[PDB]
Write a protein that binds this ligand. Sequence first.
Ligand SMILES: [Zn+2]
Ligand SMILES: [Zn+2]
Ligand SMILES: [Zn+2]
Ligand SMILES: [Zn+2]
Ligand SMILES: [Zn+2]
Ligand SMILES: [Zn+2]
Lengths: 118, 119, 119, 119, 118, 117
Amino acid sequence: TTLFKDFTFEAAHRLPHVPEGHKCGRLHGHSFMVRLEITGEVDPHTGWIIDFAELKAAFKPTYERLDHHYLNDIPGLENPTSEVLAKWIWDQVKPVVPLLSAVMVKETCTAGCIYRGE
Amino acid sequence: STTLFKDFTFEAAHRLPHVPEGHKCGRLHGHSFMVRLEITGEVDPHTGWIIDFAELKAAFKPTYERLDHHYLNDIPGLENPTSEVLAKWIWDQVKPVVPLLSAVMVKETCTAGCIYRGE
Amino acid sequence: STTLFKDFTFEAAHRLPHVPEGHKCGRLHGHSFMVRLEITGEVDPHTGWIIDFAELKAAFKPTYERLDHHYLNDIPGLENPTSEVLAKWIWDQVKPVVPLLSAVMVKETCTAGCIYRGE
Amino acid sequence: MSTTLFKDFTFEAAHRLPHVPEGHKCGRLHGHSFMVRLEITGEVDPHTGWIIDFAELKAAFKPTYERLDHHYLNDIPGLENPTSEVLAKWIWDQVKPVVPLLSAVMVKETCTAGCIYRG
Amino acid sequence: STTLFKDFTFEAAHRLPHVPEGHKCGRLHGHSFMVRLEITGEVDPHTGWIIDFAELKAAFKPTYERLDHHYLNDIPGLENPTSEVLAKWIWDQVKPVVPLLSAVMVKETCTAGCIYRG
Amino acid sequence: TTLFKDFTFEAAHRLPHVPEGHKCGRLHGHSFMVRLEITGEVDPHTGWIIDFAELKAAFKPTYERLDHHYLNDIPGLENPTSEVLAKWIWDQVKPVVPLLSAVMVKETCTAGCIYRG
Ligand SMILES: [Zn+2]
Ligand SMILES: [Zn+2]
Ligand SMILES: [Zn+2]
Ligand SMILES: [Zn+2]
Ligand SMILES: [Zn+2]
Ligand SMILES: [Zn+2]
């Protein structure tokens, strides 16, 4: 059994290692989506792995740093690609949500990335 | 491998009986639930599919109609109708009539869900 | 003219008391209700908006909390909690605090809803 | 008239709001996947069966689209206060001269928040 | 006023016969069409609605079944099956059976549609 | 680490081997969605597995054959089910994008197929 919860955040970023003309090298932004996936045993009394409210509360500090912010200013996100961001979120969240099994980030509606700790 | 999926939505009430005193989910409420039935297997050389979606619909229909426009807590097995219990419950009803079923996902909201895989 | 809109979703149970005896909507059930609040007015040349989304949210919050994770039929005025009655009821609750309110949309499902404009 | 055609475009951009109080999160540098709906109202041509060709709407909007997409809005003349409202009006002022039948511009900063400008 | 609406999707093929040679829309293709029917009228104080969605569905069903899993150009009146032509045709089929019909919207794609008010 | 990109195309098709009168046997169409998934090592400098634009560029010829077309006329798609289409897309794209790890095709909003080689 796997549980997941989606969050949207509104942020700016730019990619520093792309060619001079490359549109993503310009200052821009996205309505980012991030899905946190957790895997574990469901408790027979509560009937869940954990409460969505506790997941929200555990993610909030990391969420607050991402939302309505410029990502490049955050340590670790100097090259804030989808891939880099997905792993960065794992690194922030995994220590406080041990059951975390994947982080998906969507940069746009049609484009995204899934990281699992590999 | 090849996997096929079909999504269904149903409109239902429920309440969580085993949450702390104030918890909002402990009150009588409801959701537009989404369920995805995932099936895995060999695709037939002639039909070009694993199963006919109409077979899947027909097999799921009795379970679907018990869930849709209903109060889930009245259904035996769903006395604690969390997304996790519900996904397993749907698996337990559907697996016997859809042997190739490989997962059941339920979403209570647009942003929150559960996947169950028979383990 | 310029119109601003903001969507909220709430998770609630309801049942319709005045449908024929077998009607599925007469059963206790629920929805992920979406409400859109429309605001029509002059754009302030300093702020560059008609109203801050954050202020609209703050103004709506009390009404939102009465609806979300609740059973609608127990709320005074929502004894017949159709989309149309709900849209008017929301208007009546919100208009005093949001005088520029120009419409309330309520969607019960992804494919079904109504719009009230104050008449 | 009777018939209104519309076409949606999405662009990825940064902005910040200069005239919000110090704390306000929209005053910080951020961004959105902006959506813009262009609405055209006019007589449907008996021969083509349309009001306008979407290809011509694309080409007429392209120069304005390219200025918005993957850009920082505040650097664009006229968008020093790049609210939804200001943006929708600004788009209207750029596009209306090249698309005379333009009847409305909608911009959504998020999937739940936007506005409509009608001239 | 109060306006009610209901959305349906149908899966159909079409092609546009009066576009220049080579135009992609002149080729045989298809869409997941979406049609919204809007109804405007007084809310009945007993039912608390303008009409039952079931009455609307049943009124539209015959037209829906002509459109769904069909090739539109073979339908009389849809020889030039643009969004605009299709919306008006639907209106012309449905208005006699749904007198309170106030608008028909058709979307060919997620990003493109039209609204007809006869 | 897995990267994905979605594309939509507007196409007609019909299923030739379904029973008499079956709706899917009639000429019809869909707004098809296709998701290309690629799995691989992220480069330490670029910070990606590949540029979305190279993937877009690699799929374009195949995309061009699918979009605003009748699928049955394309060799390999004479029985254009979701399952057949997903495998066909994989066979076109895999040789050009060797890190490709899955292809999902959604025929409708609520129905689709995932193929993994
Ligand atoms: Zn970007
Ligand atoms: Zn619930
Ligand atoms: Zn209901
Ligand atoms: Zn903003
Ligand atoms: Zn078309
Ligand atoms: Zn089909």
